[PDB]
Amino acid sequence: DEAEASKFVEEYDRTSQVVWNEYAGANWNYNTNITTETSKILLQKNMQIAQHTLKYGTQARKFDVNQLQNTTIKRIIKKVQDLERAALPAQELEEYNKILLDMETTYSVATVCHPQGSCLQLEPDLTNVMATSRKYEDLLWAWEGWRDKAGRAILQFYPKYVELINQAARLNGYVDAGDSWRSMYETPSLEQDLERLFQELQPLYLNLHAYVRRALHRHYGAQHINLEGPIPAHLLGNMWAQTWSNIYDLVVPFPSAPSMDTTEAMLKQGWTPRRMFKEADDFFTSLGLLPVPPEFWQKSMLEKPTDGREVVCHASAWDFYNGKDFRIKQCTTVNLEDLVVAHHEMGHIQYFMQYKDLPVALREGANPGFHEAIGDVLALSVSTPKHLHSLNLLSSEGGSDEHDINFLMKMALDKIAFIPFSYLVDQWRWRVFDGSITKENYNQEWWSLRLKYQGLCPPVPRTQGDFDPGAKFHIPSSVPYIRYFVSFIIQFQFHEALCQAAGHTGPLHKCDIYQSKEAGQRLATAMKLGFSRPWPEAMQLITGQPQMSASAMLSYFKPLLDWLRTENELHGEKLGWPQYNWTPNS
Ligand SMILES: *[C@@H]1O[C@H](CO[C@@H]2O[C@@H](C)[C@@H](O)[C@@H](O)[C@@H]2O)[C@@H](O[C@@H]2O[C@H](CO)[C@@H](O[C@@H]3O[C@H](CO[C@H]4O[C@H](CO)[C@@H](O)[C@H](O)[C@@H]4O)[C@@H](O)[C@H](O)[C@@H]3O)[C@H](O)[C@H]2NC(C)=O)[C@H](O)[C@H]1NC(C)=O
Ligand SMILES: CC(=O)N[C@@H](CC(=O)O)C(=O)NC[C@H](CC1(C(=O)N[C@@H](Cc2ccc(O)cc2)C(=O)O)CCCC1)C(=O)O
Numbered sequence: 168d169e170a171e172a173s174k175f176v177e178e179y180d181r182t183s184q185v186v187w188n189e190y191a192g193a194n195w196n197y198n199t200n201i202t203t204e205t206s207k208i209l210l211q212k213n214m215q216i217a218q219h220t221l222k223y224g225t226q227a228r229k230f231d232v233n234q235l236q237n238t239t240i241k242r243i244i245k246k247v248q249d250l251e252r253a254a255l256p257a258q259e260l261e262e263y264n265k266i267l268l269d270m271e272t273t274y275s276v277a278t279v280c281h282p283q284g285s286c287l288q289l290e291p292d293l294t295n296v297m298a299t300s301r302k303y304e305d306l307l308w309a310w311e312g313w314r315d316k317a318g319r320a321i322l323q324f325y326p327k328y329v330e331l332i333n334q335a336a337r338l339n340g341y342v343d344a345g346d347s348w349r350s351m352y353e354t355p356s357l358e359q360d361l362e363r364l365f366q367e368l369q370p371l372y373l374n375l376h377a378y379v380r381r382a383l384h385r386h387y388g389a390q391h392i393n394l395e396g397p398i399p400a401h402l403l404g405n406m407w408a409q410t411w412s413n414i415y416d417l418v419v420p421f422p423s424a425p426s427m428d429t430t431e432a433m434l435k436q437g438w439t440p441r442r443m444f445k446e447a448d449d450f451f452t453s454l455g456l457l458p459v460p461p462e463f464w465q466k467s468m469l470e471k472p473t474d475g476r477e478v479v480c481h482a483s484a485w486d487f488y489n490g491k492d493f494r495i496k497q498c499t500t501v502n503l504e505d506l507v508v509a510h511h512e513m514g515h516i517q518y519f520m521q522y523k524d525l526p527v528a529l530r531e532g533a534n535p536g537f538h539e540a541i542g543d544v545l546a547l548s549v550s551t552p553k554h555l556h557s558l559n560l561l562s563s564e565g566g567s568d569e570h571d572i573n574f575l576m577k578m579a580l581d582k583i584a585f586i587p588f589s590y591l592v593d594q595w596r597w598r599v600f601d602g603s604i605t606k607e608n609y610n611q612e613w614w615s616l617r618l619k620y621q622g623l624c625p626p627v628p629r630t631q632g633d634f635d636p637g638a639k640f641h642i643p644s645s646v647p648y649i650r651y652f653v654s655f656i657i658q659f660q661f662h663e664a665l666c667q668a669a670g671h672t673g674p675l676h677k678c679d680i681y682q683s684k685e686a687g688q689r690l691a692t693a694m695k696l697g698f699s700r701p702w703p704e705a706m707q708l709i710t711g712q713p714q715m716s717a718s719a720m721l722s723y724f725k726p727l728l729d730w731l732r733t734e735n736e737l738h739g740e741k742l743g744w745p746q747y748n749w750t751p752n753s
């Protein structure tokens with residue numbers, strides 16, 4: 168019994184490496200070269216890996232895990248019993264795989280065109296418009312156009328996707344796909360824990376929201392901003408209003424304390440995408456963590472190709488499951504935002520390398536939020552004015568409370584603004600999956616949540632046939648999103664603990680853990696566990712305690728919360744959006 172199970176897990180691990188490596192290659196080739204051929208080979212490799220999954224998943228289900236002594240072998244076998252889509256009948260599996268590829272392709276090639284004029288892709292063109300335009304009408308053209316071309320085109324696929332992904336989840340013992348996704352956290356109290364964390368961050372978000380709304384009222388006019396209502400969703404510098412830092416110029420608390428133009432500085436100094444990832448590599452190795460192998464530099468696609476290839480430009484990090492081939496694919500733009508993204512992606516690579524000696528079944532983060540947090544932790548240190556100054560991308564900003572509040576505001580526009588967004592994406596999808604939201608009400612329930620959690624409203628009334636969730640990458644690509652909410656909270660807990668381990672004193676937001684070997688050792692021991700143990704053990708290794716907690720993030724931003732409360736009180740802001748029914752008149 169126990170001996171049969173141990174031999175089984177060894178066989179699974181040997182054959183999975185080979186098959187998973189092959190699948191990763193075909194997926195990479197399509198992702199970096201979208202063609203009918205590569206897409207045909209990908210769909211073919213899909214059926215190959217499903218045959219492997221079905222073979223070993225069927226065997227695994229014949230072990231009564233109850234009678235197993237070893238708990239690492241229990242854990243592997245329990246996971247292999249979940250076939251995911253390979254539980255579907257052959258006909259439905261083929262249809263499911265084609266739906267997913269159609270949704271992804273539709274999103275990745277959509278464009279927004281002027282009549283008799285040029286056509287813009289999402290990256291970099293429309294992203295640039297949303298980030299830099301300060302004209303209501305031009306922002307509206309891009310915001311609405313993307314949803315008209317991308318979102319509306321996904322709607323035809325989504326109901327059938329939902330049916331098929333739920334059917335697979337039921338065939339694997341879950342009640343629906345959202346149940347399956349939540350189970351990745353192995354945390355029965357997950358929904359209540361996440362709701363508690365969201366509530367703890369509400370005071371900070373409402374004060375930020377009210378301050379930004381006042382600043383938008385100053386620039387865009389009283390006729391277009393209701394100081395007691397939701398904010399129009401196209402004015403926040405980002406296609407999804409998920410991060411707001413690109414409108415820093417409109418909301419700067421102390422314009423008398425200016426910051427160097429970081430994009431001009433990178434360009435003037437000859438930064439390139441390759442330099443951006445090299446600086447990330449240096450930060451990781453400064454902590455005593457691992458460098459990326461030479462192969463990484465040869466096989467990664469670090470900028471939009473120019474040879475006519477259509478590619479999936481959305482950034483991603485790749486494990487090829489042979490312990491040696493790791494890659495990034497990013498249509499990198501030379502700016503500070505993409506430097507942070509490069510650190511994020513390099514954090515996924517670091518995790519891949521740290522757990523590469525585990526059985527492939529356990530080669531995942533302690534939970535998906537952990538995988539997302541590693542690179543962001545380092546990026547918190549990289550983002551400090553003192554570190555950016557040492558890269559020659561800022562002037563000296565120390566010894567100045569004005570510069571200090573400006574910096575906290577810059578960070579808040581990204582980190583705090585993102586909290587409600589990241590919460591609501593899977594609040595919506597979980598209710599789509601459990602049947603609470605039907606295709607009749609997809610879009611209406613999306614905007615009810617955009618209002619309830621982010622206090623945003625659409626600048627143009629939505630009409631039948633709109634499917635604005637489809638205009639957000641992770642929806643047609645079927646990537647769960649709550650990982651990013653968890654990540655944004657726990658990355659501050661990790662930062663706090665690593666700064667304490669590095670001997671930092673004083674305000675948490677001034678800490679920079681560059682070159683701390685004690686910090687790197689905490690992260691390395693946690694990452695090496697992969698998915699071999701419940702995630703509270705990895706939490707304990709990093710922070711000395713087992714819980715998720717908003718306290719670290721609230722401590723980081725405490726000086727800004729104090730300042731915002733004073734400023735909002737002085738101006739008589741009404742926090743929140745009691746006039747929640749308001750929408751733009753024109
Ligand atoms: C429950 O079972 C697990 C798993 O046991 C292993 O996997 C099963 C399928 C069988 O093949 C067993 O024969 C295997 O041992 C046990 O976990 C292992 O415990 C041992 C200690 O007894 C650990 O051994 C350590 O390994 C270190 C490095 O090994 C890794 O690195 C090499 C080379 O890089 C890599 O190729 C290899 O695959 C390893 O992953 C070594 O430095 C150290 O000194 C020590 O020898 C081993 O790492 C554990 N594996 C895992 C996956 O956790 C449990 O001990 C067992 N529990 C009980 C109560 O018996
Ligand atoms: C399974 C695998 O093999 N590869 C996976 C990694 C893994 O799970 O192992 C992978 O590469 N996924 C791609 C995805 C890309 C990005 C993303 O989509 N981010 C979210 C949310 C966000 C926003 C701001 C921010 O600062 C941090 C996160 C968004 O932009 O909406 C783009 C920019 C950042 C990360 C990613 O890396 O998470």
Ligand SMILES: *[C@@H]1O[C@H](CO)[C@@H](O)[C@H](O)[C@H]1NC(C)=O
Pocket residue numbers: 200202203204205
């Ligand atoms: C792109 O894909 C085609 C097949 O669709 C292939 O012949 C070609 O070599 C690929 N190009 C690159 C750069 O991979």
Ligand SMILES: [Cl-]
Pocket residue numbers: 407635636
């Ligand atoms: Cl939207």
Ligand SMILES: [Cl-]
Pocket residue numbers: 351535536647648649650651
């Ligand atoms: Cl997740």
Ligand SMILES: [Zn+2]
Pocket residue numbers: 511515538539
């Ligand atoms: Zn990520």
